[PDB]
Ligand binder design. Sequence first.
Ligand SMILES: CCCCCCCCCCCCCCCCC(=O)O[C@H](COC(=O)CCCCCCCC[C@@H](C)CCCCCCCC)CO[C@H]1O[C@H](C(=O)O)[C@@H](O)[C@H](O)[C@H]1O
Ligand SMILES: *[C@@H]1O[C@H](CO)[C@@H](O[C@@H]2O[C@H](CO)[C@@H](O)[C@H](O)[C@H]2NC(C)=O)[C@H](O)[C@H]1NC(C)=O
Ligand SMILES: *[C@@H]1O[C@H](CO)[C@@H](O)[C@H](O)[C@H]1NC(C)=O
Ligand SMILES: *[C@@H]1O[C@H](CO)[C@@H](O)[C@H](O)[C@H]1NC(C)=O
Lengths: 270, 98, 181, 241
Amino acid sequence: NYTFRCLQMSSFANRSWSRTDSVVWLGDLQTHRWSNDSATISFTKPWSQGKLSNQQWEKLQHMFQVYRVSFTRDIQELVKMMSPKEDYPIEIQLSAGCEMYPGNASESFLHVAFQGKYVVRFWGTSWQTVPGAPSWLDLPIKVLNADQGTSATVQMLLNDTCPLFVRGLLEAGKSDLEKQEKPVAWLSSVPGHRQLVCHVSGFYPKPVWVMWMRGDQEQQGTHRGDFLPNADETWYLQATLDVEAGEEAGLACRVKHSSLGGQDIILYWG
Amino acid sequence: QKTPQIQVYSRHPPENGKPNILNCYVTQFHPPHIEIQMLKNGKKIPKVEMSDMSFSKDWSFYILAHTEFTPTETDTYACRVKHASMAEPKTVYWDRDM
Amino acid sequence: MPVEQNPPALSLYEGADSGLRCNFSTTMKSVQWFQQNHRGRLITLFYLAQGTKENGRLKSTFNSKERYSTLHIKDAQLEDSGTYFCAAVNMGYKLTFGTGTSLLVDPNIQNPDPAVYQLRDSKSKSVCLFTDFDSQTNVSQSSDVYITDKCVLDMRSMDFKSNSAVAWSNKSDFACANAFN
Amino acid sequence: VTQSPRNKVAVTGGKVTLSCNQTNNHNNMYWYRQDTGHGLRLIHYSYGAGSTEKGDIPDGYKASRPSQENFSLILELATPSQTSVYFCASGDPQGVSYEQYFGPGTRLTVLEDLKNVFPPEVAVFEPSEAEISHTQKATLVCLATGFYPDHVELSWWVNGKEVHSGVCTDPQPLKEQPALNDSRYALSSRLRVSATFWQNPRNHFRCQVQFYGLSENDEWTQDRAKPVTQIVSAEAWGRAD
Ligand SMILES: CCCCCCCCCCCCCCCCC(=O)O[C@H](COC(=O)CCCCCCCC[C@@H](C)CCCCCCCC)CO[C@H]1O[C@H](C(=O)O)[C@@H](O)[C@H](O)[C@H]1O
Ligand SMILES: *[C@@H]1O[C@H](CO)[C@@H](O[C@@H]2O[C@H](CO)[C@@H](O)[C@H](O)[C@H]2NC(C)=O)[C@H](O)[C@H]1NC(C)=O
Ligand SMILES: *[C@@H]1O[C@H](CO)[C@@H](O)[C@H](O)[C@H]1NC(C)=O
Ligand SMILES: *[C@@H]1O[C@H](CO)[C@@H](O)[C@H](O)[C@H]1NC(C)=O
């Protein structure tokens, strides 16, 4: 089960300064990037085109180039329509893509956030405000909905283009999506109580099991931190244990992961 | 407006005098305009590579800065961050022991 | 041949300027140009015993001594499509017709999108459609499967000038893909 | 200049009669036939009423000029060699010109047996949702089948009016089974409209096939309906889907 996400980052500082940046993910792996300083979408994997032909991709890229310029100019105008009610700096984020399921199943979405709060979505055949959205958004919505050309484009991309593309992508990059990277652990401590730390790095995929053990007994004081990424699309996790002095003896850190094949890493505290 | 959270960690077990990658994960910020510097003994590291800015399910931004570094007994490595949500730039030091 | 018309077939783009020639084995008394439409009707364009004649987008010249007659088409349109006949009057006052020049005015297909579509019938078989290809595209043949050649656009068509081919078969279920390779 | 009939189907050995008429009061009247790689070849001509001169290819044809206005071409014993398109024209010498003025044309088809004449069966194939989504356009397909002889006229009619924009039609028909001497024909046509125009249920699409077969003059013994000159149509209403 994998999720495809297109993330847009639009910034409008004033009426003469704008910046748009986009990234695309297939699970926790990046397939595309597109910065403002670049004319075309960049592939970040050798399989990022999926099973699309060069002509199919050229047409898709061209439609995104037109969309980027149009989007910028269209939002700059909606502000002229909204002011004094709305003022710069304005942040707009788009989160599109389709969730994938076994067989032929798929669920597409296009979510829009204004100043960080989710305000609009593309539903059915038009743009609509979501619950909680402010009343001034009714007018720009009618301005956006008069663009029947775009509604037909978005309807084609969400309904047909997205599932078709991702399905081709999941086949093109399954060698990368099913990669198994062995974690590497190491122990350290900070200072009459010490705090022992078990660092776990370079593992792929995300599910990992880290525990401080005392023999066959799990130490319930194990505080497992958040997953933070490494630059090479692998994960880093650390698990800490707060212990009284002299009771560090007999403590070990056990690491369990799919890539190790039932052979856990066990690091002893000495 | 959301204040960033800075986390500084190394890619491989730190061995004094051995090449490693220092990572600086900056998260939970808004607006996306941020300035991230990686400093070796207070001086700005020149070929610092930065990930593409992305955002989480909560719409807050996240970015990763990383550089090649070689841990030593003498050198100190840090990550300095400037963001509108802060009056003074926040510095986090790399502590191999943390 | 007393009235030699070249080429037998001409295929020019929309808005293009072209010209047709007629050569004679002897000195002819007059020339008469015709446009035969796709509905088979012959319509006189020009009658000349000497000199040049202009009639809007068309021009015709007849040189008795130089044994030729020309027909010029300025800014070609769909309506110019059809067989252009050139008939001269030989000794014995007999009007002699040339074999003809079939003209085909093609639109400039800018962004080609070659594709195959399966169309369902209006009552309760099925047809395949090869459309949105360019001019430098040749349609194949072959056996219980029928494939049409590139169609000929209506001479009065003012929009949707997309050339296409049709395929069908007696067999059911018929493979829509393996029809146009 | 007019011609009567405009289409005629005859039997090998039958007596065929093509007539011409001009009201311009021109002295000369000419009879031509059109075939490929030959253009138009003169059969017979006339300089006035009561006189007729042999053209270039007169063998198998006779011509009568009863009056100034009418000039007839008679095929006493018709042969499949005479299956052609006959054009008639007038010439006015009194206007010091060699210019001729041509009639609409008459198509003639000489057959072995009239029991082989077949009317066409028409079918309309609705546009694929695949095209409508991708191109934002919609092509309809008219498909005339199992008719004999090869000549038929095909036209599209949207909401009772004939259309020409978006119309593409095959130049010639194709033999349904070429490994047969009396093989029936097939001919297709396309109508391309904007996706929304088709998707509208209030728009009525109809392709019309005009068959050119027998007259009421011809005798019919078969149990099937006389395959006379008729119009056969197939229609479709636009659907949302
Ligand atoms: C990247 C890898 C490929 C993956 C393929 C899968 C793609 C699926 C992801 C879908 C991504 C979504 C992108 C959208 C596509 C649209 C498009 O791609 O359609 C575009 C239309 O853009 C416009 O003209 C308008 C752009 C602005 C509309 C954006 C909505 C504004 C956001 C509001 C809601 C915010 C409201 C807040 C107001 C507060 C401010 C007031 C203070 C471009 O497409 C145009 O050009 C195409 C072409 O030339 O090929 C034509 O084919 C197409 O018909 C035409 O519409
Ligand atoms: C894309 O999918 C949506 C479903 O999410 C389709 O939306 C329905 O469209 C019909 C006809 O336009 C409406 O009567 C329904 O009310 C729509 N449903 C919703 C949830 O609004 C849409 O038609 C599809 N678009 C294309 C181009 O196929
Ligand atoms: C617009 O914004 C940029 C970036 O915030 C700023 O440097 C520039 O001075 C601004 N210009 C005006 C005219 O406000
Ligand atoms: C983004 O790109 C557009 C391209 O026309 C440019 O006008 C704009 O100034 C760019 N903004 C920045 C800050 O790079």
